[PDB]
Structure formats: C-alpha cells, structure tokens
Design an enzyme around this catalytic site. Structure first.
Site, PDB file in Angstrom:
ATOM      1  N   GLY A  86       0.846  -1.205   0.000  1.00  0.00           N
ATOM      2  CA  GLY A  86       0.000   0.000   0.000  1.00  0.00           C
ATOM      3  C   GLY A  86       0.867   1.234   0.000  1.00  0.00           C
ATOM      4  O   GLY A  86       2.079   1.142   0.183  1.00  0.00           O
ATOM      5  N   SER A 134      -0.143   9.594   0.386  1.00  0.00           N
ATOM      6  CA  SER A 134       0.638  10.797   0.697  1.00  0.00           C
ATOM      7  C   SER A 134       1.382  10.669   2.032  1.00  0.00           C
ATOM      8  O   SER A 134       2.458  11.248   2.194  1.00  0.00           O
ATOM      9  CB  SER A 134      -0.223  12.067   0.649  1.00  0.00           C
ATOM     10  N   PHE A 135       0.829   9.870   2.956  1.00  0.00           N
ATOM     11  CA  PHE A 135       1.471   9.577   4.247  1.00  0.00           C
ATOM     12  C   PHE A 135       2.851   8.912   4.110  1.00  0.00           C
ATOM     13  O   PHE A 135       3.738   9.130   4.941  1.00  0.00           O
ATOM     14  CB  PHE A 135       0.554   8.698   5.120  1.00  0.00           C
ATOM     15  N   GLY A 136       3.035   8.116   3.061  1.00  0.00           N
ATOM     16  CA  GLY A 136       4.243   7.306   2.899  1.00  0.00           C
ATOM     17  C   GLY A 136       3.885   5.934   2.344  1.00  0.00           C
ATOM     18  O   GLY A 136       3.073   5.822   1.403  1.00  0.00           O
ATOM     19  N   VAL A 137       4.474   4.891   2.933  1.00  0.00           N
ATOM     20  CA  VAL A 137       4.351   3.520   2.408  1.00  0.00           C
ATOM     21  C   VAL A 137       4.015   2.492   3.491  1.00  0.00           C
ATOM     22  O   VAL A 137       4.442   2.634   4.630  1.00  0.00           O
ATOM     23  CB  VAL A 137       5.659   3.075   1.664  1.00  0.00           C
ATOM     24  N   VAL A 138       3.264   1.454   3.096  1.00  0.00           N
ATOM     25  CA  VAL A 138       2.898   0.313   3.930  1.00  0.00           C
ATOM     26  C   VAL A 138       3.485  -0.984   3.375  1.00  0.00           C
ATOM     27  O   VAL A 138       3.337  -1.290   2.186  1.00  0.00           O
ATOM     28  CB  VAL A 138       1.382   0.130   3.958  1.00  0.00           C
ATOM     29  N   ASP A 189     -12.250   9.623   8.444  1.00  0.00           N
ATOM     30  CA  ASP A 189     -12.000   9.097   7.093  1.00  0.00           C
ATOM     31  C   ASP A 189     -12.590   7.665   6.928  1.00  0.00           C
ATOM     32  O   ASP A 189     -11.919   6.718   6.477  1.00  0.00           O
ATOM     33  CB  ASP A 189     -10.501   9.170   6.752  1.00  0.00           C
TER      34      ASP A 189
HETATM   35  C1  LIG Z   1      -5.962   1.336   4.065  1.00  0.00           C
HETATM   36  C2  LIG Z   1      -5.436   2.007   5.320  1.00  0.00           C
HETATM   37  N1  LIG Z   1      -4.030   2.426   5.241  1.00  0.00           N
HETATM   38  C3  LIG Z   1      -3.587   3.209   4.079  1.00  0.00           C
HETATM   39  C4  LIG Z   1      -2.979   2.354   2.981  1.00  0.00           C
HETATM   40  S1  LIG Z   1      -3.053   2.113   6.404  1.00  0.00           S
HETATM   41  O1  LIG Z   1      -3.413   2.896   7.555  1.00  0.00           O
HETATM   42  O2  LIG Z   1      -1.730   2.507   6.010  1.00  0.00           O
HETATM   43  C5  LIG Z   1      -3.008   0.561   6.830  1.00  0.00           C
HETATM   44  C6  LIG Z   1      -2.653   0.274   8.155  1.00  0.00           C
HETATM   45  C7  LIG Z   1      -2.575  -1.021   8.666  1.00  0.00           C
HETATM   46  C8  LIG Z   1      -2.843  -2.099   7.844  1.00  0.00           C
HETATM   47  C9  LIG Z   1      -3.212  -1.796   6.417  1.00  0.00           C
HETATM   48  C10 LIG Z   1      -3.286  -0.487   5.935  1.00  0.00           C
HETATM   49  C11 LIG Z   1      -3.423  -3.141   5.843  1.00  0.00           C
HETATM   50  C12 LIG Z   1      -3.815  -3.571   4.473  1.00  0.00           C
HETATM   51  N2  LIG Z   1      -3.955  -4.872   4.166  1.00  0.00           N
HETATM   52  C13 LIG Z   1      -4.314  -4.990   2.863  1.00  0.00           C
HETATM   53  C14 LIG Z   1      -4.583  -6.095   2.059  1.00  0.00           C
HETATM   54  C15 LIG Z   1      -4.943  -5.907   0.718  1.00  0.00           C
HETATM   55  C16 LIG Z   1      -5.040  -4.631   0.144  1.00  0.00           C
HETATM   56  C17 LIG Z   1      -4.787  -3.476   0.892  1.00  0.00           C
HETATM   57  C18 LIG Z   1      -4.429  -3.645   2.223  1.00  0.00           C
HETATM   58  C19 LIG Z   1      -4.093  -2.718   3.308  1.00  0.00           C
HETATM   59  N3  LIG Z   1      -4.060  -1.355   3.219  1.00  0.00           N
HETATM   60  O3  LIG Z   1      -4.365  -0.717   2.015  1.00  0.00           O
HETATM   61  C20 LIG Z   1      -3.166  -4.077   6.944  1.00  0.00           C
HETATM   62  O4  LIG Z   1      -3.254  -5.348   6.826  1.00  0.00           O
HETATM   63  N4  LIG Z   1      -2.839  -3.441   8.087  1.00  0.00           N
END
Ligand SMILES: CCN(CC)S(=O)(=O)c1ccc2c(c1)/C(=C1/Nc3ccccc3/C1=N\O)C(=O)N2
Length: 348
Positions: free
Chosen positions: A29, A32-36, A147
């Site tokens: 993922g 704008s916050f950065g990367v996951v 959000d």
């Molecule tokens: C969607 C919410 N976020 C922004 C990407 S996040 O706060 O960074 C954020 C925080 C903790 C998180 C996640 C995302 C997250 C995610 N698992 C996923 C599995 C498939 C597709 C997208 C995501 C996803 N995210 O797209 C997960 O398993 N723990």
C-alpha cells in the site's frame, strides 16, 4: 534471505524498547502519508503490516498518540513502533507495525460489483455491525476517525472479522475548540463539512458509515461528486434541499438553492432491498447531525437481528466472530441498550 532487526517499543505495553526481527518484506500500500509493507515476524511467524510515515520534529505524531490508546477486536492493533531512516536522507521515519489483514471491504464489494452482483446482505450486516462497534468504542474516548470509507475497513473473509484502520485523519474532538472542515474522503464527507462547519462532532463518522452502507446495497458510491459543490448536488438529488433549520443545525452561518424534492428512499435502491436496510440508511444519512443515530443505537437496530439469532452461521459454515462481548466503556453512551445488544444465549 534478508532479515531486519529493529529496536521497537510495544504499542500498548510499557516503554521498554526491545529487539524485533522480521523478514519477507513487500510493498502492499501507499499514499501521501508514505508507504505500507507486509513483513513476517521471525518471533512467531505472524504476518504484520508496517506503516512508514515522515516525522516532523516540531510536533508529536497524533496518529501514534491515538493508536497507543486503542484496544478493540474491531480495530487494527498497534503492536510496536520504531524509528528508522528512509528515502529523504537526514530525516526520521516513524514505523507503525500493525495487525496484518489480507482484504478490504472495498475489494470484496468490487469483486461482486465487477460481476454485476451485489454482496449478500448477511455480509452487509456483519461488516456494518462491526464498523458501528469500532465507532462506539472510539467515540467513547471522544476520538473521531474522520475518514470512514470501504478502503479503510480491513477484512478477514474466512472469519468475516472486520477491523477499522488508518487513523491518519483521526482527532480528539474538544467542545469549543475548532476543527478543519475539509476532511474525510469526498464521497463520504458529511454535509455540515461541505457547508464549512468547524464545530462538528463525532456524528460526521456516522454520516460516512451511512454512505458505506448505501454503497454496499447499491454496488457503487451513493454520492459521487467531482468537487465539494457538486458533492452537495449529489446529496440534494436524493435527500432534497436542506431546510433553513437544517442549515442552522449544520452550520449556524452558511444561501438559496434550486428548491428540489427528496427522492423516495425505496427507489434509490434495487427492487428487493430489505426494508430494514433502507430504514437504517435513512436514520444515518440525515442533514441534522443530532438526528443521526449514535453508533451504539445503530448496532441495536432491527437490521442486525439476524446476527443475534442463536443459530446464525457464516455462509462458509464457520461460527460468526465475536459480536456480543461488549465492555463497560463500549456501552457507556447508553447502558440500557445492553438488553438488546447482548442476547440471552451470549451471556451464560
Ligand atoms: C488502508 C489504510 N491504510 C492506508 C494504505 S493504512 O493505515 O496505512 C493501513 C494500516 C494497517 C494495515 C493496512 C493499511 C493493511 C492492508 N492490508 C491490505 C490487504 C490488501 C489490500 C490493501 C491492504 C491494506 N491497506 O491498504 C493491513 O493489513 N494493516
């Protein structure tokens, strides 16, 4: 095979930094916050997500502050945090290591949508009910998420367990201390915010929940505006022009619109939509913020009776997740609701 060891502080425990080792790193993922990233904890083989954001050294990270406080089955748990370097050298990154969950409500609904089908209503009830629990819990601390949208609702589709994520816009709301009006993703943004309110409450989350519910029933967003003004136009086409009193309740300041009639609720949705889903939706998507159900009252709505049936199972055969283990904190806005919320078969 590359293993990374960092020194990280436990999310909820005491501030003793400890060594944490992980491997199997991949991007899953960004924004704008950065990367996951996805990673695997060497410790227990458990999968986690690592959210890496830029840290302004002027000010504390409010996302971090809020997440440290949270302990709930329907909320992604902050396990650890640590600091590292990254792309813009001489800068500091905050790493949040969170529960990993492999699907989103958005992705699941799109699978159905691409096949010109709508999600079976049993899943709509499971997801929406878990959303309202997580909102009841955060609102009891005065925290507003700001959000709420399908992309921020993580899902384990085998268990149907839902977890709220992305507390990047969340904030402790203090009565008399003003807040930014341009927040929430546009399709999900409450009308009082479109009208520039700065004194709004947690009820904006409920309006967003109402938009998620209607998207699940429709197979597409209910209010797809291209800007804020056009967002109001989309809302009006369904709800009609807000009255003077409604404007007052929304923003005691903010015109003359094309006078337009409310569209009947029943024909917003497909022919066979359960009436209870529609009645719920109408009590969430209200102009007057105070008129919207609270999260706890939403959980107790008739729409969710089927989840309180002793013989209810998931479609795949497995038992439903935890739904009735409410705590004192969760029930605090309205204690007598427990008689409805906790069925006889779930007390024992
Ligand atoms: C969607 C919410 N976020 C922004 C990407 S996040 O706060 O960074 C954020 C925080 C903790 C998180 C996640 C995302 C997250 C995610 N698992 C996923 C599995 C498939 C597709 C997208 C995501 C996803 N995210 O797209 C997960 O398993 N723990």
């Amino acid at each position: 095979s590359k293993v990374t060891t960092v020194v990280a502080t436990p999310g909820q425990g005491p501030d003793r930094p400890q060594e944490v080792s992980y491997t199997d790193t991949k991007v899953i993922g960004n924004g704008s916050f950065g990367v996951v990233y996805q990673a695997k904890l060497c410790d227990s083989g458990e999968l986690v997500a690592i959210k890496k954001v830029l840290q302004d050294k002027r000010f504390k990270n409010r996302e971090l502050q809020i997440m440290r406080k949270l302990d709930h089955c329907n909320i992604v748990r902050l396990r650890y945090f640590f600091y590292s370097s990254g792309e813009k050298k001489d800068e500091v990154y905050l790493n949040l290591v969170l529960d990993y969950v492999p699907e989103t409500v958005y992705r699941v609904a799109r699978h159905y949508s691409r096949a010109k089908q709508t999600l079976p209503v049993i899943y709509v009830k499971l997801y929406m009910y878990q959303l309202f629990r997580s909102l009841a819990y955060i609102h009891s601390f005065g925290i507003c998420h700001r959000d709420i949208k399908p992309q921020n609702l993580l899902l384990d589709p085998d268990t149907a367990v839902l977890k709220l994520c992305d507390f990047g816009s969340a904030k402790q709301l203090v009565r008399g201390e003003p807040n930014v009006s341009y927040i929430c993703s546009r399709y999900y943004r409450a009308p009082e915010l479109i009208f520039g309110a700065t004194d709004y409450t947690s009820s904006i989350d409920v309006w967003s929940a109402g938009c998620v519910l209607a998207e699940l029933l429709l197979g597409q967003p209910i209010f797809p505006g291209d800007s804020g003004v056009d967002q109001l136009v989309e809302i009006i086409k369904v709800l009609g022009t807000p009255t003077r009193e409604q404007i007052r309740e929304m923003n005691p300041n903010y015109f003359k619109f094309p006078q337009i009639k409310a569209h009947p609720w029943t024909k917003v949705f497909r022919p066979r939509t359960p009436p209870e889903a529609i009645a719920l939706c109408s009590r969430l998507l209200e102009y007057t913020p105070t008129a919207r159900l609270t999260p706890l009252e939403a959980c107790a709505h008739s729409f969710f009776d089927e989840l309180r049936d002793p013989n209810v199972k998931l479609p795949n055969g497995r038992d439903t997740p935890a739904l009735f283990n409410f705590t004192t904190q969760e029930l605090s806005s309205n204690p007598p609701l427990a008689t409805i919320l906790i069925p006889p078969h779930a007390r024992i």
